[PDB]
Amino acid sequence: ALQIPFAMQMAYRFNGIGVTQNVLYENQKLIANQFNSAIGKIQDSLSSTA
Amino acid sequence: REGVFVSNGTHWFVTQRNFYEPQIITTDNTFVSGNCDVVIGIVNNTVYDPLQPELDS
Numbered sequence: 001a002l003q004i005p006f007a008m009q010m011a012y013r014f015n016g017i018g019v020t021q022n023v024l025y026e027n028q029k030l031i032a033n034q035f036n037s038a039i040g041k042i043q044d045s046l047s048s049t050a
Numbered sequence: 051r052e053g054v055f056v057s058n059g060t061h062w063f064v065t066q067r068n069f070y071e072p073q074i075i076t077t078d079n080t081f082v083s084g085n086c087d088v089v090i091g092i093v094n095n096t097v098y099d100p101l102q103p104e105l106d107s
């Protein structure tokens with residue numbers, strides 16, 4: 001395991017889908033808010049029905 | 051453009067992701083976007099420009 005800062009991991013992962021790294025870094029707070037919100041929606045989905 | 055920025059503690063280099071091979075950071079190794087306000091955790095170093103040593107003529 002090689003440590004890497006989590007934003008820089010996402011920058012590699014965006015570059016892995018042909019989206020240029022700066023499209024992450026210029027939007028990092030938006031992307032974090034979307035991700036954190038989406039995880040919250042999984043808890044609601046799982047809580048709502050078995 | 052490819053690889054990642056690193057420093058040994060004093061000098062900044064670009065290097066490829068899976069094998070340490072430091073290179074000077076240049077206008078050829080990089081691409082510009084935006085400005086210094088936007089990026090979280092950006093840092094200050096010279097970027098070298100291979101045209102200017104030629105235009106020193």
Ligand SMILES: *[C@@H]1O[C@H](CO)[C@@H](O[C@@H]2O[C@H](CO)[C@@H](O)[C@H](O)[C@H]2NC(C)=O)[C@H](O)[C@H]1NC(C)=O
Pocket residue numbers: 058059060061
């Ligand atoms: C970081 O890397 C640079 C380049 O390898 C080091 O700077 C060189 O250090 C040697 C030995 O002290 C000198 O002979 C060179 O003239 C230096 N080159 C330049 C461009 O300054 C630097 O010492 C390294 N720093 C650390 C903290 O390891």
Ligand SMILES: *[C@@H]1O[C@H](CO)[C@@H](O[C@@H]2O[C@H](CO)[C@@H](O)[C@H](O)[C@H]2NC(C)=O)[C@H](O)[C@H]1NC(C)=O
Pocket residue numbers: 092093094
């Ligand atoms: C990178 O360099 C810039 C200047 O080129 C630094 O910006 C100054 O920072 C001080 C302290 O916050 C302010 O008082 C100045 O008004 C800033 N000037 C400008 C033009 O913004 C910046 O702090 C440096 N960053 C790092 C991480 O060293």
Ligand SMILES: *[C@@H]1O[C@H](CO)[C@@H](O)[C@H](O)[C@H]1NC(C)=O
Pocket residue numbers: 090091
């Ligand atoms: C990085 O972490 C240090 C503490 O380890 C903190 O002081 C600093 O503000 C952080 N910087 C960024 C860009 O996250």
